[PDB]
Amino acid sequence: TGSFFINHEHDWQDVEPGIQRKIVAHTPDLMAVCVKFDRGAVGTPHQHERHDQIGYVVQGAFEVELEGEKRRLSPGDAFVAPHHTMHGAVALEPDSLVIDLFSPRRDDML
Amino acid sequence: GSFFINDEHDWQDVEPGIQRKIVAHTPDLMAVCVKFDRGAVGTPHQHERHDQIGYVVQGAFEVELEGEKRRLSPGDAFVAPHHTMHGAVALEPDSLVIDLFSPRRDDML
Ligand code: NI
Ligand code: NI
């Protein structure tokens, strides 16, 4: 049907120490999640068997690893990890923000 | 996997008042950064085959979703499943929205 997401209207949910998120929007094929990292918070390297993922950097910076290759990403930069692609991140500045986008939707995050 | 470094890519003209950069894509997922001049209009339209999310990162837009209007600023978003009418009017110079699609929009390449 269609929805709006008003950021101010939604709390941060705890993912783990130094990491918070908010589910932004989704359909069965497409999901956006806003993720907030303290400086030095770590997204452990991992792979998705069934989901594609793009991380778009909105604030702060991240060192992102894609299958061993590292790149420093600052606001406006992005990575894409097709499914079966190892990726991980380390946040380099306070309140680093990345938009994780997925296809299909990540039902495990509800 | 692939990286997109914004400083390495030029803006591409879409139409008057509108430029973009294709950020990243797989066959099932695509991100596009779209820049609007103030008062530039994305005329209302539907996609037969693509779900769309617009995530606002700079400036402000009035977004129309099946006749409902909201003013969206940085951090706000809309979701338009396929067959949902949506359009936008940019409210500020250099207003930026990340349009997200599934599957990818091959017509943009
Ligand atoms: Ni992931
Ligand atoms: Ni559209």
Describe the structure.
The complex is a heterodimer of chains A (110) and B (109). By secondary structure, chain A is mainly beta. Chain A has no helices and 11 strands. The relative contact order of chain A is 0.28. In chain A, a hairpin with a 2-residue loop joins strand 7 (62-66) and strand 8. Chain A has one domain (1-110): Jelly Rolls (Sandwich). Chain A has strands at residues 3-5, 13-16, 19-26, 31-37, 42-46, 52-59, 62-66, 69-73, 78-81, 87-91, 96-103. Chain B has one domain: Jelly Rolls, CATH 2.60.120. Chain B starts with a strand and ends in a 7-residue tail after the last strand. Chain A binds chain B through residues 1-8, 24-27, 29-30, 32, 34, 52-54, 56, 58, 64, 66-67, 69, 71, 73, 76-82, 85, 87, 99, 101-104, and chain B through 1-6, 23-26, 28-29, 31, 33, 51-53, 55, 57, 63, 65-66, 68, 70, 72, 74-81, 84, 86, 98, 100-103. One nickel (II) ion (NI) binds next to loops of chain A. The PDB classes it as lyase. Keywords: lyase, kdgf, pectin, alginate, uronate sugar metabolism, cupin. It forms a dimeric assembly. The entry is titled "The structure of KdgF from Halomonas sp".
State the CATH topology of chain B: Jelly Rolls
The CATH topology of chain A comes to Jelly Rolls
Q: What is the rounded distance between the termini of chain B? A: 18 Å
Q: What are the secondary-structure elements of chain B, in order, as H or E? A: EEEEEEEEEEE
The beta-strand count of chain B equals 11
Percent of residues of chain B in helical segments? under 10%
CATH architecture type of chain B: Sandwich
Strand residue content of chain A: over 45%
- Label the CATH architecture of chain A: Sandwich
Quickly name the level 1 CATH class of chain B.
Mainly Beta
What Rg of chain B is obtained from the alpha carbons, in whole angstroms?
Answer: 13 Å
Within the largest sheet of chain B, what's the order of strands?
2-3-4-11-6-9
- Number of helices in the DSSP assignment of chain A: 0
Oligomer: heterodimer
For the report, how would you describe the main beta sheet of chain B? 6 strands, antiparallel
PDB class: lyase
Keywords: lyase, kdgf, pectin, alginate, uronate sugar metabolism, cupin
Assembly: dimeric
Entry title: The structure of KdgF from Halomonas sp.
